[PDB]
């Protein structure tokens, strides 16, 4: 567990913060509507999660430059970690699709939830790293 985002950084100009929020909300949305949802519904719910993550990654890309070169590696790693978390969510989603009409629809739906939850938690860990980085840069 990590502490709430540091309070020593202004967040009105933080697009990383904003996109992490946007991503965690897309995850919260999907996991609140998923139990009774059919493939027509939850496939777009995951699409939205992906869009959210893509935006996030793009933004991180355009941030690394303003950050100490010594931090670019941990951030580049955090980014690859998220791409795979999305990868696992899509895997499980496809399985859920495949097994609609069967007992496994609900099992794989639980797995999508787990995947999505990992992605949200990791998006927040990315934020904590990038924040650690901004503070080194601000000295």
């Amino acid at each position: 567990i990590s502490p709430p985002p540091t309070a020593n950084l202004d967040r009105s100009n933080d697009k990383v913060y904003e996109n992490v929020t946007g991503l965690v909300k897309a995850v919260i949305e999907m996991s609140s509507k998923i139990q009774p949802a059919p493939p027509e519904e939850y496939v777009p719910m995951v699409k939205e999660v992906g869009l959210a993550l893509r935006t996030l990654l793009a933004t991180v890309d355009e941030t690394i430059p303003l950050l100490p070169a010594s931090t670019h590696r941990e951030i580049e790693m955090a980014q690859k970690l998220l791409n795979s978390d999305l990868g696992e969510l899509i895997n499980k989603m496809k399985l859920a699709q495949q097994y609609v009409m069967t007992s496994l629809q609900q099992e794989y739906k639980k797995q999508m939830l787990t995947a999505a939850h990992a992605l949200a938690v990791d998006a927040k860990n990315l934020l904590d790293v990038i924040d650690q980085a901004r503070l080194k840069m601000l000295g």
Binding site: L53, D61, L86
Partner: peptide, 12 residues
């Protein structure tokens, strides 16, 4: 992001 978009293209 090109591999990420192979994924983003998978949901159509």
């Amino acid at each position: 992001t090109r591999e990420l978009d192979e994924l983003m293209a998978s949901l159509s």
